[PDB]
Write an enzyme that holds these catalytic residues in place. Sequence first.
Site, PDB file in Angstrom:
ATOM      1  CG  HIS C 202      -3.169  -6.488  56.922  1.00 30.15           C
ATOM      2  ND1 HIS C 202      -3.122  -5.890  55.682  1.00 30.15           N
ATOM      3  CD2 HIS C 202      -1.896  -6.503  57.379  1.00 30.15           C
ATOM      4  CE1 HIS C 202      -1.876  -5.558  55.402  1.00 30.15           C
ATOM      5  NE2 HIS C 202      -1.111  -5.919  56.416  1.00 30.15           N
ATOM      6  CG  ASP C 206      -2.514  -0.659  54.540  1.00 31.79           C
ATOM      7  OD1 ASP C 206      -3.413  -1.515  54.666  1.00 31.79           O
ATOM      8  OD2 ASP C 206      -2.245  -0.110  53.451  1.00 31.79           O
TER       9      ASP C 206
END
EC number: 2.3.1.12
Lengths: 229, 229, 229, 229
Positions: C202, C206
């Site tokens: 992450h 995204d």
Amino acid sequence: VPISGMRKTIAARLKESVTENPHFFVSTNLSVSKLLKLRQALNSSADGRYKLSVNDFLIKAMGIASKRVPTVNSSWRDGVIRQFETVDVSVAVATPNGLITPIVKGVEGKGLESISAAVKELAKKARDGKLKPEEYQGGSISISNMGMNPAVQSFTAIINPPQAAILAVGAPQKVAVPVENEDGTTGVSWDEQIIVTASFDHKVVDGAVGAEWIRELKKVIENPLELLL
Amino acid sequence: VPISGMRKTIAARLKESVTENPHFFVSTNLSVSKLLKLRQALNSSADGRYKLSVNDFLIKAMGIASKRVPTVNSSWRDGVIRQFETVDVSVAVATPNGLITPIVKGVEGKGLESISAAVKELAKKARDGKLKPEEYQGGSISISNMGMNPAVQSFTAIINPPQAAILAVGAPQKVAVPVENEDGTTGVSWDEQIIVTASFDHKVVDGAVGAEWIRELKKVIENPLELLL
Amino acid sequence: VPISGMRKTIAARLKESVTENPHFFVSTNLSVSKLLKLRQALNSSADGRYKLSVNDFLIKAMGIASKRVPTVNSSWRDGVIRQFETVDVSVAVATPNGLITPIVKGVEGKGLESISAAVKELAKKARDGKLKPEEYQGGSISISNMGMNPAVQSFTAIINPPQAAILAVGAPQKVAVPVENEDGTTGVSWDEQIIVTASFDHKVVDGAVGAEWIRELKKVIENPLELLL
Amino acid sequence: VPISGMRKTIAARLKESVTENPHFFVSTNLSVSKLLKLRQALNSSADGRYKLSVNDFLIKAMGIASKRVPTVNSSWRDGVIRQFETVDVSVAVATPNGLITPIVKGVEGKGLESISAAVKELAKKARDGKLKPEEYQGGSISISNMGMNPAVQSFTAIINPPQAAILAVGAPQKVAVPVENEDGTTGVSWDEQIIVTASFDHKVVDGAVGAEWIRELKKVIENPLELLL
């Protein structure tokens, strides 16, 4: 990769051919539906004593055409035209080493079985590399074959000097041809065609003479029975 | 009208080509009925992001064939044969100033979309006259196209030195082809054929090698799914 | 049983991965009814020269998706993002000694046959234990396959650092799908589906970016012809 | 490429989340064939005064479930559990700059039109970059949506701290469902399903509690009329 040196001689020879002798090409179409039936019949009426192909019939027809039109079976020498009487045929063989041209002697009036036997012998001897210079130095006329490769519809070649002509036989193909049924209407029939390409030297031969040679060849093939003549 | 001077260089170059390298030609017929369907489907499954042509497929197939038979992708140098690994393709463009040969680099494993983009870019840059010498000086293999002109069934071209081979693609045409219906009788099917002519230099390449190259090209075209391989 | 010591390193590596990099997963369903037909046809149109699987198509599609969305083909370094241009693919192999990840280089624009050959060689060399460290140290993206086991519908994996993403391909299954017959009524068609699970880091990627990547993958698969592009 | 610095903070935040809070996931399947009819009818019975989506219904249902089970609407603080009464909903938006989470306040007992208006305003203000910190700092529960991308069946996300739970809504899909016709035989009906994935923190919530929350959500959705309650 350096050059083997052997290719140098062939390159020089071909350069001499193209720079000394101009080249013009003739392209025709033959019909072999009867020739293949003849080949099949002669192969079946046999006891393994022989095996025939298309190249042998073509060689016999070449000899007959050369005898009916001797101007092709000629050459170019020092201020003089050398004309032979017999037909010496140079057949090309594609070795991993390159290309080679063994010779068949006295084609006209020799016999298809003898022809096939001699060609098989010379081809295997060239694959082995066991030839003499006289067996591939000389010859009045030449030929190259590519019938095994079905993709080649046609192709040209280069005149192995000091000769005057050279032939080339493409692969067989399926072509549409008209045909008259018993009634007045036309129909479709599938004939097996081959394209043939002949390159000539213009110093010796003219377009009319080459066309006459090709006509005689086409006639002899389309009527295979005239091979006896 | 005096000569522009630029034509002098091209004349000398072509003269060097024909006098240094002998030429022999091969002529074949491809079947493109599946290729056109593939092109239609790929053009339909898009959002205006690209647009394909036949020349791009031909270029990819040229790369594949050159990789399968590396002897063609070669040249002739000072007592040495220079053999490449990648395929540099010289594409011809007909400007009002004459002829020009931009280059595409690393064709094998590049992608048809990238190929089409590069070709369009180089073509418009040639029409505008905005090229660098490196972009059209080099290349191992070449090609010329005339598919827009439907009258040309076939044609030959001349080997842009120092290369060894060159291709030429005529227009498409309608031809009769046999077909077996579900019964035993044959039928008539109309396939779209193209004639292809390949000119080779005889110093490097031989007839068997050219035939093998053409066979691989025909196979790849007739089975377009092998382009992935 | 005391520990072999080799497992210690892998444990520390995976611990570093999970503690440094947060993981979120994306799970989708593909349709391969056309892909399997394509594979069968390419296998039939061959002379035993090659043999294909599903993983190779998947790897090509991974390369295409990575090139269309380069943010995935990334990493995390000391205060800097290292972004590659080519796609190096780490393929998992399950040896009796444990797990190993050989690498394929330059996937995009390489060819499925070469891919399969390299994968077979690397797999056999891993079963034999004959690898170099460079061959399994690196890679921008990774993959694990369990298609041989028909019980596994889906499964997750762990991101081999310092990479940013990893894939997982379950088994094929039979699913009900609507279909419109020639009339206005709907019908039931049985499509062959696969579940795919992608784990992402992450810090770099995204949810929107991962979704875009997966959309492109699904598109290229469901339309296999775009593998050419 | 050096790092923007903004990503550093989000990386540290997500790292804190995964290292402080253990994650377990719950995955279910909903039925929205009635929900979509309701949305279509409410859109048709309007004068362009409003326009609805699926996320708004989902947010209302989240509020209802949170009120029926207040343990979810919780947090983890210094030796104390902070429990709210109202539901503050953090909605994700994917900007080219990255990810952002505006907040809607007092969802339970607010109205779908007001919800849609506030969401549109916040989304456009986030695309413009015109937000205050208070508008995206806080919230008890969060959500991420990917319904526009039809490829994603399911996906997980990460718990934005200090919250305790987060939702994820995949795309809609077609699934086979049994149905009893007027006779005793069963039949095939095509229902529009969505997969939903909820990530929970295990310090606060247990599996039974999460299951109860999901059951209430499924009930309220499958019977949309209970949104009034």
